[PDB]
Each structure stands twice: as structure tokens, then as C-alpha cells.
Design a protein around this motif. Structure first.
Motif, PDB file in Angstrom:
ATOM      1  N   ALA C 211       0.850  -1.180   0.000  1.00 23.31           N
ATOM      2  CA  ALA C 211       0.000   0.000   0.000  1.00 23.31           C
ATOM      3  C   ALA C 211       0.889   1.234   0.000  1.00 23.31           C
ATOM      4  CB  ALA C 211      -0.954   0.012   1.199  1.00 23.31           C
ATOM      5  N   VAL C 212       0.280   2.391  -0.245  1.00 26.22           N
ATOM      6  CA  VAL C 212       1.013   3.647  -0.358  1.00 26.22           C
ATOM      7  C   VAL C 212       0.209   4.756   0.309  1.00 26.22           C
ATOM      8  CG1 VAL C 212       2.435   3.139  -2.383  1.00 26.22           C
ATOM      9  CG2 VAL C 212       0.045   3.866  -2.667  1.00 26.22           C
ATOM     10  N   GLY C 213       0.910   5.676   0.959  1.00 31.31           N
ATOM     11  CA  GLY C 213       0.259   6.815   1.584  1.00 31.31           C
ATOM     12  C   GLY C 213       1.276   7.653   2.326  1.00 31.31           C
ATOM     13  N   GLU C 214       0.906   8.913   2.547  1.00 30.91           N
ATOM     14  CA  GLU C 214       1.794   9.865   3.205  1.00 30.91           C
ATOM     15  C   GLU C 214       1.751   9.657   4.715  1.00 30.91           C
ATOM     16  OE1 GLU C 214      -0.668  11.797   0.759  1.00 30.91           O
ATOM     17  OE2 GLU C 214       0.628  10.498  -0.443  1.00 30.91           O
ATOM     18  N   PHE C 215       2.926   9.500   5.327  1.00 32.17           N
ATOM     19  CA  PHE C 215       3.019   9.222   6.753  1.00 32.17           C
ATOM     20  C   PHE C 215       4.089  10.023   7.484  1.00 32.17           C
ATOM     21  CE2 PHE C 215       0.840   5.355   5.341  1.00 32.17           C
ATOM     22  CZ  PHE C 215      -0.141   5.252   6.301  1.00 32.17           C
ATOM     23  N   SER C 216       4.835  10.895   6.801  1.00 37.08           N
ATOM     24  CA  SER C 216       5.858  11.698   7.455  1.00 37.08           C
ATOM     25  C   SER C 216       5.840  13.163   7.047  1.00 37.08           C
ATOM     26  CB  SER C 216       7.256  11.123   7.179  1.00 37.08           C
ATOM     27  OG  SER C 216       7.776  11.616   5.957  1.00 37.08           O
ATOM     28  N   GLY C 217       4.899  13.584   6.205  1.00 34.10           N
ATOM     29  CA  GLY C 217       4.862  14.966   5.773  1.00 34.10           C
ATOM     30  C   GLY C 217       5.985  15.367   4.847  1.00 34.10           C
ATOM     31  N   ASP C 218       6.597  14.408   4.157  1.00 29.11           N
ATOM     32  CA  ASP C 218       7.703  14.675   3.248  1.00 29.11           C
ATOM     33  C   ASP C 218       7.244  14.930   1.818  1.00 29.11           C
ATOM     34  OD1 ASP C 218       6.872  12.110   2.655  1.00 29.11           O
ATOM     35  OD2 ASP C 218       8.873  11.223   2.669  1.00 29.11           O
ATOM     36  N   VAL C 264      -2.986  -5.009   3.315  1.00 31.17           N
ATOM     37  CA  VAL C 264      -2.765  -3.732   3.975  1.00 31.17           C
ATOM     38  C   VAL C 264      -3.430  -2.637   3.155  1.00 31.17           C
ATOM     39  CG1 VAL C 264      -0.636  -4.441   5.089  1.00 31.17           C
ATOM     40  CG2 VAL C 264      -0.559  -3.392   2.834  1.00 31.17           C
ATOM     41  N   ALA C 265      -3.519  -1.456   3.757  1.00 36.12           N
ATOM     42  CA  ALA C 265      -4.089  -0.293   3.098  1.00 36.12           C
ATOM     43  C   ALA C 265      -3.483   0.957   3.720  1.00 36.12           C
ATOM     44  CB  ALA C 265      -5.616  -0.291   3.201  1.00 36.12           C
ATOM     45  N   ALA C 266      -3.773   2.104   3.110  1.00 38.37           N
ATOM     46  CA  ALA C 266      -3.285   3.381   3.622  1.00 38.37           C
ATOM     47  C   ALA C 266      -4.191   4.473   3.076  1.00 38.37           C
ATOM     48  CB  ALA C 266      -1.835   3.609   3.218  1.00 38.37           C
ATOM     49  N   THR C 267      -4.969   5.099   3.954  1.00 40.15           N
ATOM     50  CA  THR C 267      -5.898   6.136   3.532  1.00 40.15           C
ATOM     51  C   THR C 267      -6.253   7.002   4.731  1.00 40.15           C
ATOM     52  OG1 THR C 267      -8.140   6.553   2.678  1.00 40.15           O
ATOM     53  CG2 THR C 267      -7.736   4.448   3.776  1.00 40.15           C
ATOM     54  N   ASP C 268      -6.765   8.197   4.432  1.00 41.05           N
ATOM     55  CA  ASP C 268      -7.130   9.196   5.437  1.00 41.05           C
ATOM     56  C   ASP C 268      -8.468   8.820   6.078  1.00 41.05           C
ATOM     57  OD1 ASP C 268      -7.108  12.871   5.381  1.00 41.05           O
ATOM     58  OD2 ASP C 268      -6.823  11.408   6.987  1.00 41.05           O
ATOM     59  N   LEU C 274      -4.014  13.421   7.173  1.00 42.47           N
ATOM     60  CA  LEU C 274      -2.907  12.521   7.470  1.00 42.47           C
ATOM     61  C   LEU C 274      -3.367  11.092   7.233  1.00 42.47           C
ATOM     62  CD1 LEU C 274      -1.379  14.974   8.986  1.00 42.47           C
ATOM     63  CD2 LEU C 274      -0.534  13.161  10.476  1.00 42.47           C
ATOM     64  N   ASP C 275      -2.686  10.392   6.328  1.00 37.89           N
ATOM     65  CA  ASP C 275      -3.052   9.018   6.014  1.00 37.89           C
ATOM     66  C   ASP C 275      -2.811   8.115   7.218  1.00 37.89           C
ATOM     67  OD1 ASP C 275      -3.778   9.190   3.100  1.00 37.89           O
ATOM     68  OD2 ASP C 275      -1.717   9.927   2.966  1.00 37.89           O
ATOM     69  N   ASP C 276      -3.560   7.018   7.282  1.00 45.91           N
ATOM     70  CA  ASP C 276      -3.505   6.106   8.414  1.00 45.91           C
ATOM     71  C   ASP C 276      -3.389   4.673   7.918  1.00 45.91           C
ATOM     72  OD1 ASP C 276      -4.084   8.452   9.995  1.00 45.91           O
ATOM     73  OD2 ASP C 276      -6.199   8.126   9.542  1.00 45.91           O
ATOM     74  N   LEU C 277      -2.853   3.817   8.784  1.00 48.82           N
ATOM     75  CA  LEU C 277      -2.548   2.437   8.436  1.00 48.82           C
ATOM     76  C   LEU C 277      -3.717   1.518   8.768  1.00 48.82           C
ATOM     77  CD1 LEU C 277      -0.673   0.202   7.569  1.00 48.82           C
ATOM     78  CD2 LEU C 277       0.340   0.204   9.833  1.00 48.82           C
ATOM     79  N   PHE C 326     -12.158 -12.694   7.605  1.00 51.12           N
ATOM     80  CA  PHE C 326     -12.257 -11.248   7.505  1.00 51.12           C
ATOM     81  C   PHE C 326     -10.870 -10.633   7.642  1.00 51.12           C
ATOM     82  CE2 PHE C 326     -12.225  -7.379  10.014  1.00 51.12           C
ATOM     83  CZ  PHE C 326     -12.998  -6.523   9.263  1.00 51.12           C
ATOM     84  N   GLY C 327     -10.496  -9.797   6.676  1.00 52.87           N
ATOM     85  CA  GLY C 327      -9.164  -9.224   6.656  1.00 52.87           C
ATOM     86  C   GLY C 327      -8.298  -9.793   5.553  1.00 52.87           C
ATOM     87  N   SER C 328      -8.899 -10.058   4.392  1.00 50.42           N
ATOM     88  CA  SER C 328      -8.187 -10.683   3.285  1.00 50.42           C
ATOM     89  C   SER C 328      -7.773  -9.705   2.192  1.00 50.42           C
ATOM     90  CB  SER C 328      -9.047 -11.789   2.664  1.00 50.42           C
ATOM     91  OG  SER C 328      -9.144 -12.905   3.530  1.00 50.42           O
ATOM     92  N   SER C 329      -8.541  -8.644   1.962  1.00 46.99           N
ATOM     93  CA  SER C 329      -8.217  -7.682   0.913  1.00 46.99           C
ATOM     94  C   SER C 329      -8.741  -6.311   1.309  1.00 46.99           C
ATOM     95  CB  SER C 329      -8.807  -8.112  -0.433  1.00 46.99           C
ATOM     96  OG  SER C 329      -8.632  -9.499  -0.651  1.00 46.99           O
ATOM     97  N   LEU C 330      -7.863  -5.462   1.833  1.00 48.57           N
ATOM     98  CA  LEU C 330      -8.208  -4.087   2.163  1.00 48.57           C
ATOM     99  C   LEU C 330      -7.738  -3.160   1.055  1.00 48.57           C
ATOM    100  CD1 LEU C 330      -6.576  -5.252   5.098  1.00 48.57           C
ATOM    101  CD2 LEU C 330      -8.296  -3.644   5.887  1.00 48.57           C
ATOM    102  N   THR C 331      -8.571  -2.175   0.740  1.00 43.29           N
ATOM    103  CA  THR C 331      -8.283  -1.185  -0.286  1.00 43.29           C
ATOM    104  C   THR C 331      -9.164   0.038  -0.064  1.00 43.29           C
ATOM    105  OG1 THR C 331      -8.587  -0.711  -2.642  1.00 43.29           O
ATOM    106  CG2 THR C 331      -9.772  -2.601  -1.715  1.00 43.29           C
ATOM    107  N   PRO C 332      -8.589   1.238  -0.080  1.00 42.85           N
ATOM    108  CA  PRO C 332      -9.362   2.436   0.270  1.00 42.85           C
ATOM    109  C   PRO C 332     -10.557   2.638  -0.650  1.00 42.85           C
ATOM    110  CG  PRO C 332      -7.016   2.910   0.302  1.00 42.85           C
ATOM    111  CD  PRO C 332      -7.160   1.535  -0.282  1.00 42.85           C
ATOM    112  N   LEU C 333     -11.626   3.194  -0.080  1.00 40.99           N
ATOM    113  CA  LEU C 333     -12.829   3.531  -0.825  1.00 40.99           C
ATOM    114  C   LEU C 333     -13.069   5.028  -0.928  1.00 40.99           C
ATOM    115  CD1 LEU C 333     -15.170   0.786   0.574  1.00 40.99           C
ATOM    116  CD2 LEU C 333     -15.137   1.345  -1.856  1.00 40.99           C
ATOM    117  N   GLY C 334     -12.513   5.822  -0.019  1.00 39.88           N
ATOM    118  CA  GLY C 334     -12.746   7.248  -0.072  1.00 39.88           C
ATOM    119  C   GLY C 334     -14.109   7.630   0.480  1.00 39.88           C
TER     120      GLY C 334
END
Lengths: 144, 357, 423, 182
Positions: C211-218, C264-268, C274-277, C326-334
Motif C-alpha cells: 500500500a502507499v500513503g503519506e506518513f511523514s509529511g515529506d 494492507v491499506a493506507a488512507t485518510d 494525514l493518512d492512516d494504516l 475477515f481481513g483478506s483484501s483491504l483497499t481504500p474507498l474514499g
């Protein structure tokens, strides 16, 4: 595991109690049995589980002991008691046996073929039959 | 409401648990408690199956396991009068990436110098027999195999040993499964690497004493392994090495009726491990609620030796149960027409509870 | 009005899904017999007299007799990812024969299409001097992957370094500059990859999910990579800095062998910028009040705070279904319900009354993710002998028809179909 | 009553193979392990090994793993022991014995009548009975059976016996009826 069961052979009076010990090379956890060998016949089980009595065996036979030391106690003998007694272990493999005790009950001391009868004790080698159940005598016949 | 105890044959001076049947009768606020006087009966028959890792890490362990059947019986003599032993083998699933699928290495999954049998998920080497000699001989005839990744596929073998009641030869006695490994364990999800996406369904897929359906079925989850081990009265003894002791020690916390133990690099203490683990298991009694819910909740309060009394999950458990020791289980079905089955796990001997309310 | 679609049955179609908006769903059928000569069930990626687009029309390459790379059962198309005019169809079981020594190492090979297949780049970063899984031999590059917002290719090979796992990362530009198919080993310069860790991290399956997402403000997308078998089989999920991978955080799991990192996933999820795990554990067993141990599953949500990400999950929402994984495929929905609060989908392979498999969708809230899926989605077709697998590979979070709301695409390879849903 | 009916006394040549049978009756042949306990004339019991009618596996001691090919037939409830590469020193009695239920109770409860195989390089020979003309003396006869018989350097059995004596011969069928006379 090698069982040097004692004694090699013995003779006792009628009705005498005798203990026959089968010491094992290691603690066998009551894995010891006893067998009796009548001449010209198959051996028969006497004591199983080191304490229990097999069916058809007179109650004079008894088993005891635990761990390494075990005893075969016979509560009085009879002429029916003659035979070769083997202690059998069941701990490791191969199965081991004892040397065999000749439980021969004692009594009062006693071409042409030469017959010899009523002697006690005792090119071509001559065999002697086992003592008879009636009078327990030994006979020898040699050809010369 | 009332206990309505029926067919309570008194515990034998074989019934290890009395009542062996009763019908409780009330619902809301029900605290109906029936003392299950559990008496550990001496000489209750035990069936044992030794599932062994056959990856190259246990090449030396197999030599020690060679002479195990006779020895395990010689040691369980003092605990039971009628005992049986059987053997199974497992290495890994017979596909990439857990093994290399080259033509040269499919015959010898290990290195060129290390001779190894072609990989196999599970092979029922021996079915349960009172002849430990057959165990020893069939174990000695087994040839070491190998795989590529450190974890090994033993969970599919555990399920296959459990499910095949007739073919493995399970009796209506206490069943023990000494699952021996020195490395980690594959489980459900570990099969996605090799494209094995359908999990272990939990059926008898044993053809010619060989789990030929490796490529089709995945390793089972720990939950499904627990279900199949408990539902078949099998008490697992996870004999694993010290490098994975903080692994299987946590594993035993989830799997009921287990007792992990540590072995040397060559599993030399496996027999002592089995004896101590089964001493812990027999001195334990995890009564099971069998399966009942939506109108039944069972709270437990054990009163075991030395006056220790547990509550809840602790109350479902007893400890320090000596030979012939009587413990009292304040089993309170709270409820809140059906005959469900209360079993001490690992015991086919049962008590029958009917909540006719 | 649910839009129920279908795909080619009996070819392992449905093993993955994607998005497109330059309009195209790249679904892989990794056990499909190909038209490549001398190739047995290599696999393909389908965009459908219906024929898939031949990613590499020519058959298995030959060693300069014996082929130089085993396309047979290469499982090509298991994981397909796309960003813009780029496609990263990878073959996790692509066992190329190392030109040095004959080896069936599934290095994994992604065919990086550019500008709608005008040029196909054989991008196999795990195909390098490191082999045998001592390096990146059995790495299976492309077992999981993802795309950043800059087009940067992120790959996760859960077999690299004796299945420790690793995250690869190189942009399209470096791939093109280092592109030379005449050599099967292309050392791509400037490729950010996780360094090889100690042997105590072996068999950790890092990058099993990506997964991908911003986690350090870089201002760069920071990699999230599930590690379901790390930390003595408890499983953790590390987060890595985008500019250089380094090691930002770790997050241990709260049960053994639960596969903390299967997905895994990564979304606000908290909607604070701030994105979250989010982590899933399909093997999360849990004893019922009856004392019967039965898997029900739960998802761990590590909310990110401005001071950093707390090592404990702020919420671990739990599944109630029996053995649902439960917990096999997480992906953000927005923003599904239009409240400015991003949601997340999750798939149950073996859940439901008839082993159908509900896709659970959680609502937003101040604490982050929910604990009880507000909207319940199930497969529409009747159950059969073969499993539905409805939710073993899913993607979502973008808009397809431009209706003003985000949609989601479900990849169900039990029956080899797909379903889209719109708000 | 568990009984183990063995074949008659076999005769083999040094280097040949003999197949001693054991027609086990009165118990489940497959369910119980069947062992062979060699017993030389005048010696003790030595455990040859064991057969398993259920799964077919056999295991012997270090002295019988390569020599005695043990086998069992499930259908006929008969177990065989193949004395491959025989030696005249192995002329003995071979017992088929059943364990006392098995497990740790590996006690030889039941013993067959005994198959006294006579492995020698001499063919069947008629019983030469020549008395003094009180009893009948049997000399230079093969094979046993008809004072236990004792083998001499001549290679044939001989026994002494002390009404007309009727020495029988099952294999040779050379019945001799010599009147006991001085």
C-alpha cells in the motif's frame, strides 16, 4: 538388554517354595513374562505383566517385582512342574530371553544293547530321556 | 428448575465422569450447577499418532524417532493398559516456490550432495496398530526429503491425520498427536505464493497412504486445525525445538488441550516430552460446552486438589489431578428440547446434558 | 442497481483487478494456456472472437534447445497494477532460467507497458545477479505491487532474502533509461529498495501486500508493506519513507499466525489530512463465550497522529461471521457517503451462510475506521461447489463513469467474474 | 482356543530355501503380529523376527534381516518364513508365536506344535531296524520323526527304543513291524 536369569539350574524337594529372578539390563517397567518348556512340546505362558497369572496355570505360580528386579515364585512343586523356564522381556528389540532353568524335582538317590536304569544323578553320543511323571528315573542305552 | 440426573453410573473405583447423563430444566437466571465428579481412571486406553517433519532439518531427528513406538508404549505402560501408535510423514507441498521445480531438483529438492526423496505433503506411513514394531520398521523405511523455505507444511498433514478416522485407525479412546518440528509452520495464506488458493477442506484425501492432493489444497488455518483436533478428541503435543519455543509456546495458548515442549537438535527428549505433556494434559480437564448457544451459557467453577478453585476459563480447568483424584466441577448452565454433548477434551467418555428448561 | 459482470470461466480469471481513467480492467488469469509456443498454462492479462492483449507475443525465450526462462506455469497476471498509460502485469511464479546456471527461480517479471502498449519493458528488478532467494531469486516480484501519484512503480516480493520480503521502487523514467532487453539483467540505477535485514527477519513475507500513503509529511508517498509472518509469526506492518525507503515505523500484531499483513491499506480514515494504516488478519481466531475456538477476524487500524503513529491500534474492528477470514483484501474507498471521511473495503473469501463472502464496508468517524460495516455487499449469483472467493482480490477508490462518486471493482476468481458498485 | 497348525517337518539342502507355514486359527490372523522363535535342539529361544499380515511389514534381528525372508498370506491365514541361503547348522525347531494382545504385553502366549526342519545334504532313507535277534533299535534313518533321536557322523538319524514294535515313517512310508525278540 540381556537377561541373565538365575539360576542356571536347580532341584528342590516336593512342595518347596523357590524364587527365580530375571534381572534386566535396564528398568523394563513391568515388561517381563515367563514361559515353561515341557520336553518335546511347545512352551507355555505362565506369568504375564510380571505379576499376573495366565489362564490354566496353577495358582502356585506368582509374579512380582518392578523396575529392574523381578521374581518368579512357585508355591510348592509337583512332578507336573518339570520344565525349562524362560523369562522374556518386551522393552527393546530384539526380544531377549533367559538361559532357561531346568526345574527338575529331586527324589531319593538311586548287536547287543546294554540297558542302564535307575541312576541319579549322571564315537557315538547317547541321549537320556527326561524323567517320567511316575517315578522320575533316568535311563541310558548305548550301542557298542 | 431441577438437575433431573439420569444414567449417573457411579465413577469406576470405565466411567471417568459422573453423571454420564442428566437433563437440567430451567432458563432465565438459571444457575443450575451439576457437580461433574471427574475421577481420573487408571488404565484408560490411549491411541497415539506421531506426525513427524521430514524436511532435511529433521534428517537427524528421524534417526531418534526410528525407535519410538516400542519406547513410547514401554513408557505409557504405567499410565494406560491398552495403547496404540501410528506414524505419519510430511515435508512440504509439491510445487513452487516451496520447492524448486527444475527437472534435476524435483527428484532431489535438497542440494546435489544431500540425497532427498521427491517432496510430498503427507504420507500415512503407518495406521494405528498395537504393534510398535510395525511403527519402528515403517519409520525406518522412510527416506528423508527436503524443501526450500524454512517453514514446513505440517498443518495439512495434521488435518489429514485427524480426518481419516477409519484409515488412520482411530479408536474410541484418548487420542494424542505428537506433532514434531524444528522449524516454523506454514498455514493458510502461505499457499498463495505457490498459487494454491483453495484451502484444506478437511476431508480424507488419502490415496494409497499418500496425500496426493497437495497441489490442490492449501495449508489449513490454525482455527480450522483447532476445530479438527478438538472435534476428533486429539490432544496435540507440539514437540518443537528451542529456537521456535517462543513460537509454539504461544501456539499452545490458542490450541486447546496442547502442551508444547523443547527438544534437542535431534529430538532426543521426545519421549520425556510426550510423558510430561500428557501428565499435564491428564492432570488437566478442559470440559467442553460441546456446541450450544443462543439460549445457553455455561460458567464453570472447578474445585480441584489442594483447594484451588477457578472461575470462568480458570473454572473450566483443573490442575494437579492425581491418579484417581476426584474433582468437583460447579458447571452452571445459565441458558438465557435439545440434548447437547459435554466432553472433557481428549475424552470420548461423555456426559449428556438436556436443557428441557 | 448492482452491475453484475462476468469473465471467462475455467481459466483462473479474476485473480486481480484495477482501475483506468486516461475504462479498462486488467484482470489476470495466471493458469490460462497461452498462445506462446512451447508454453504450458503460463497465464495472461485480459482486456475483453475475443482475445487478450499479448503482453509478449513471442513465446518463451531460448538460451543462447533449452529455453532461457520457463514460461510454463509462470502464473503470469496474478497481480496486475496500472497508473495512467502504464501497466505492471507481473508473473509471481515466472521461473526464469538464470543464464549462469539452470534455475527455476520465480524472480517475478512485470511487463511495464507505456503509452498503451507502444513499448513493453521487461521490468524484473528481482531478476538480477542475486538469485536462489539468497538475494531476489524466489522473490516473486509482483506478488503484490502498487503505484504512487507520480507514476513510481512500487513492487513487493515476499520471497526476497529467504522470504524476508522487500519493497522495490523505481519510476518509469529510470526503467526506460536502463531499458535494454538484449540483456535479461537490467541493473536499474537509482532504485529505492529496502536493504537486506538480518536473518532473524527471515520468512517474514514483507511486501506480501503493498500500500502507499503519506506518513511523514515529506510530500512523497510513503510505502506500507505487510509483513504477515514477521515478529515470531505475529506479523507486523512497517512504513517506509518515500524519498528513501529507510525505516519509519513498525507495528506488531496482537495474535499469533493471524497473518498480520495478508492485506494492507493506507488512507485518510480520520480525515485530518494525514493518512492512516490499516491491516487485515484473515486467520484471526477467537474463542467464543462457549469456549469453542472459532475464527471471526478483526482489522487493526493504526491511526496516525501529528506527533507520529501510536504503536497500538486505535481501533481493531472485529468480524462476527464464522470462519469468514475477515481481513483478506483491504483497499481504500474514499468518501462513499459524502461526509469527507474515507472508508475501506474488505473481502471475505469463505464467509457468509453459503460460503459466498460478504465485502464489508465501514463508515467514517472521529476514531478512524468503524467496527461494524455500515453497508453490506454480497455476491448475487447462486453458490456452487467451487468457492466464490468473492473478495480475495479487490481494488477501488476511483471513479470510472464520472458520475460524481467513487466506485469499486471486485475481483472474484472463484467463478471468474467481477462486480462494480456506484453511489 | 487359539491354535497354530504348522506344516510338517521340512527338509532342505544347504543353500536352498524352505517355506515353513503356520496356519493360524482361532484368532484374527491380520490383527495380531506373528513372530518366529527359532529354537535349536537343546538350546534356548532366539527371536528371529516378526511378520505383519495387516500392512506386510517385517522386521528381524541383525542375524535374520538378510537371511530369513518373512512373509504372510492374508487370504489363507498362513505365514511363511523363507530360509534363504540355508546352512546345515540351522537344523532346528521353528515356532510361530502370537503376542499376548501386543502393546507392551509382548509375551509369547501361544506356540505352534513346532516345525523341526532337518536341513542336510542326505535324501530320504528307509528305517534300518536291526534288533539283537528288550526293544527295537532304529539306526541310519532319515528323516525325523518315527530316547530322542541323535545324529551321528554318518549323516542319518538314529534312536533307541526300550508285542510287536511298529516304527512308522510319514515321509518315507517304509513301515517296518519287527517283533521284539531276544
Amino acid at each position: 538388554i540381556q537377561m541373565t536369569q538365575s539360576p542356571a539350574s536347580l532341584s528342590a524337594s516336593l512342595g518347596d517354595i523357590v524364587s527365580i529372578e530375571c534381572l534386566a539390563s535396564e528398568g523394563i517397567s513391568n515388561n517381563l513374562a515367563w514361559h515353561q518348556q515341557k520336553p518335546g512340546k511347545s512352551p507355555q505362558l505362565l506369568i504375564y505383566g510380571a505379576h499376573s497369572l495366565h489362564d490354566g496355570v496353577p495358582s502356585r505360580f506368582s509374579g512380582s517385582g518392578s523396575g529392574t528386579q523381578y521374581s518368579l515364585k512357585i508355591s510348592g512343586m509337583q512332578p507336573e512342574d518339570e520344565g525349562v523356564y524362560y523369562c522374556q522381556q518386551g522393552y527393546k528389540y530384539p526380544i531377549t530371553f533367559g538361559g532357561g532353568t531346568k526345574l527338575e524335582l529331586k527324589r531319593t538317590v538311586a548287536s547287543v544293547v546294554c540297558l542302564l536304569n535307575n541312576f541319579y544323578p549322571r564315537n557315538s553320543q547317547e541321549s537320556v530321556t527326561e524323567q517320567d511323571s511316575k517315578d522320575s528315573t533316568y535311563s541310558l542305552s548305548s550301542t557298542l | 428448575g431441577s438437575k433431573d440426573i439420569k444414567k449417573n453410573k457411579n465413577v469406576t473405583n470405565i466411567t471417568q465422569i459422573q453423571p454420564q447423563q442428566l437433563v437440567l430444566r430451567l432458563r432465565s437466571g438459571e444457575p443450575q450447577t451439576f457437580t461433574l465428579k471427574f475421577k481420573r481412571a487408571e488404565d484408560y486406553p490411549i491411541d497415539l499418532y506421531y506426525l513427524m517433519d521430514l524436511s532435511y532439518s529433521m534428517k537427524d531427528d528421524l534417526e531418534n524417532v526410528k525407535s519410538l513406538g516400542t519406547d513410547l508404549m514401554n513408557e505409557m505402560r504405567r499410565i494406560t493398559s491398552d495403547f496404540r501408535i501410528g506414524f505419519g510423514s510430511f515435508v512440504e507441498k509439491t510445487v513452487m516456490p516451496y520447492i524448486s521445480t527444475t527437472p534435476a531438483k524435483l527428484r532431489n529438492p535438497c542440494t546435489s550432495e544431500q540425497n532427498c526423496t521427491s517432496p510430498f505433503s503427507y504420507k500415512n506411513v503407518l495406521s494405528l496398530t498395537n504393534k510398535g514394531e510395525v511403527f519402528n520398521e515403517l519409520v525406518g523405511k522412510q527416506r528423508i526429503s527436503g524443501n526450500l523455505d524454512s517453514p514446513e507444511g505440517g498443518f495439512d498433514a495434521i488435518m489429514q491425520v485427524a480426518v481419516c478416522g477409519s484409515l488412520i485407525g482411530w479408536r474410541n479412546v484418548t487420542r494424542l498427536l505428537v506433532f514434531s518440528t524444528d522449524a516454523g509452520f506454514h498455514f493458510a495464506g502461505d499457499g498463495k505464493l505457490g498459487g494454491i488458493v483453495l484451502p484444506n477442506d478437511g476431508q480424507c484425501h488419502l490415496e494409497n497412504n499418500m496425500y496426493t492432493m497437495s497441489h490442490y489444497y492449501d495449508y489449513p488455518s490454525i482455527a480450522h486445525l483447532v476445530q479438527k483436533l478438538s472435534e476428533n478428541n486429539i490432544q496435540t503435543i507440539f514437540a518443537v525445538t528451542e529456537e521456535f519455543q517462543p513460537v509454539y509456546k504461544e501456539l499452545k495458548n490458542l490450541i486447546p488441550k496442547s502442551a508444547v515442549g523443547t527438544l534437542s537438535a535431534n529430538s532426543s527428549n521426545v519421549i520425556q516430552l510426550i510423558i510430561d505433556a500428557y501428565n499435564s494434559l491428564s492432570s488437566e480437564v478442559i470440559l467442553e460446552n460441546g456446541k450450544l448457544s443462543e439460549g445457553v451459557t455455561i460458567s464453570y467453577k472447578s474445585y480441584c486438589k489442594n483447594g484451588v478453585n477457578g472461575t470462568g476459563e480458570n473454572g473450566r480447568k483443573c490442575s494437579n489431578i492425581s491418579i484417581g483424584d476426584e474433582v468437583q466441577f460447579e458447571i452452571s448452565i445459565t441458558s438465557n428440547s435439545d440434548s447437547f454433548k459435554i466432553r472433557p477434551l481428549g475424552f470420548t467418555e461423555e456426559v449428556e446434558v438436556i436443557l428441557q428448561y | 442497481a448492482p452491475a453484475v459482470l462476468s469473465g471467462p470461466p475455467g481459466s483462473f480469471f479474476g485473480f486481480s483487478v484495477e482501475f483506468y481513467r486516461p475504462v479498462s480492467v486488467l484482470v489476470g488469469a495466471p493458469k490460462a494456456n497461452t498462445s506462446q509456443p512451447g508454453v504450458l498454462q503460463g497465464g495472461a492479462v485480459y482486456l475483453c472472437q475475443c482475445t487478450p492483449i499479448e503482453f509478449d507475443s513471442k513465446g518463451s525465450r531460448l538460451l543462447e534447445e533449452e529455453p532461457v526462462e520457463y514460461k510454463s506455469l509462470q502464473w503470469f497476471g496474478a497481480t496486475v497494477r496500472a497508473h495512467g498509460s502504464s501497466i505492471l502485469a507481473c508473473a509471481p511464479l515466472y521461473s526464469w532460467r538464470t543464464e549462469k546456471e539452470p534455475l527455476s527461480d520465480p524472480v517475478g517479471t512485470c511487463y511495464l507497458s507505456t503509452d498503451n502498449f507502444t513499448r513493453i519493458l521487461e521490468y524484473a528488478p528481482c531478476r538480477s545477479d542475486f538469485s536462489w532467494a539468497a538475494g531476489q531469486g524466489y522473490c516473486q516480484g509482483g506478488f503484490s505491487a502498487e503505484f504512487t501519484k507520480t507514476g513510481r512503480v512500487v513492487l513487493g516480493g515476499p520471497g526476497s532474502y529467504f522470504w524476508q520480503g522487500q519493497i522495490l521502487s523505481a519510476t518509469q523514467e529510470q526503467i526506460a533509461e536502463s531499458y535494454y532487453p538484449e540483456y535479461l539483467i537490467n541493473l536499474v540505477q537509482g532504485q529505492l529498495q529496502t536493504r537486506q535485514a538480518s536473518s532473524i527477519y527471515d520468512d517474514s513475507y514483507l511486501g506480501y501486500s503493498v500500500a502507499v500513503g503519506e506518513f511523514s509529511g515529506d510530500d512523497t508517498e510513503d510505502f506500507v508493506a505487510g509483513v504477515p509472518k514477521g515478529n515470531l509469526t505475529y506479523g507486523y506492518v512497517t512504513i517506509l519513507n518515500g524519498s528513501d525507503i529507510r525505516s519509519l515505523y513498525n507495528f506488531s500484531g496482537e495474535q499469533m499466525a493471524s497473518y498480520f499483513g495478508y492485506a494492507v491499506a493506507a488512507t485518510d480514515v480520520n480525515g485530518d489530512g494525514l493518512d492512516d494504516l490499516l491491516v487485515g488478519a484473515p486467520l484471526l481466531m477467537d474463542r467464543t463465550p462457549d469456549g469453542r475456538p472459532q475464527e471471526v477476524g478483526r482489522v487493526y487500524v493504526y491511526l496516525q497522529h501529528p506527533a507520529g503513529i501510536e504503536p497500538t491500534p486505535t481501533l481493531t474492528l472485529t468480524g462476527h461471521d464464522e470462519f469468514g477470514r475477515f481481513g483478506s483484501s483491504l483497499t481504500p474507498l474514499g468518501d462513499l457517503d459524502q461526509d469527507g471521511y474515507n472508508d475501506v473495503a474488505i473481502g471475505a473469501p469463505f464467509g457468509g451462510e453459503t460460503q459466498q463472502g460478504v465485502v464489508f464496508v465501514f463508515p467514517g468517524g472521529p476514531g478512524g475506521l468503524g467496527s461494524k460495516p455500515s453497508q453490506v455487499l454480497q455476491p448475487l449469483w447462486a453458490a456452487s461447489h467451487t468457492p466464490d472467493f468473492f473478495g480475495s482480490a479487490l481494488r477501488g477508490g476511483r471513479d470510472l463513469d464520472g458520475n460524481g462518486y467513487p466506485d469499486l471493482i471486485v475481483g472474484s476468481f472463484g467463478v471468474d467474474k467481477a462486480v462494480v458498485y456506484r453511489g | 482356543e487359539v491354535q497354530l497348525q504348522q506344516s510338517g517337518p521340512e527338509v532342505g539342502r544347504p543353500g536352498s530355501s524352505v517355506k515353513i507355514s503356520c496356519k493360524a486359527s482361532g484368532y484374527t490372523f491380520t490383527g495380531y503380529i506373528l513372530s518366529w522363535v527359532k529354537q535349536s535342539p537343546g538350546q534356548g529361544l532366539e527371536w528371529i523376527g516378526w511378520v505383519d499380515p495387516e500392512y506386510g511389514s517385517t522386521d528381524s534381528a541383525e542375524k535374520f534381516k538378510k537371511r530369513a525372508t518373512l512373509t504372510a498370506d492374508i487370504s489363507s491365514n498362513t505365514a511363511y518364513i523363507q530360509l534363504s541361503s540355508l546352512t546345515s547348522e540351522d537344523t532346528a525347531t521353528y515356532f510361530c508365536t502370537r503376542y499376548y494382545d501386543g502393546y507392551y504385553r509382548r509375551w509369547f502366549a501361544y506356540w505352534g506344535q513346532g516345525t523341526l526342519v532337518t536341513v542336510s545334504s542326505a535324501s530320504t532313507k528307509g528305517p534300518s531296524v536291526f534288533p539283537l535277534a528288550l526293544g527295537c533299535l532304529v539306526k541310519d534313518y532319515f528323516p525325523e520323526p518315527v530316547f530322542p533321536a541323535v545324529l551321528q557322523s554318518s549323516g542319518l538319524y538314529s534312536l533307541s527304543s526300550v508285542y510287536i514294535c511298529n516304527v512308522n515313517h510319514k515321509p518315507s512310508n517304509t513301515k517296518v513291524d519287527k517283533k521284539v525278540e531276544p
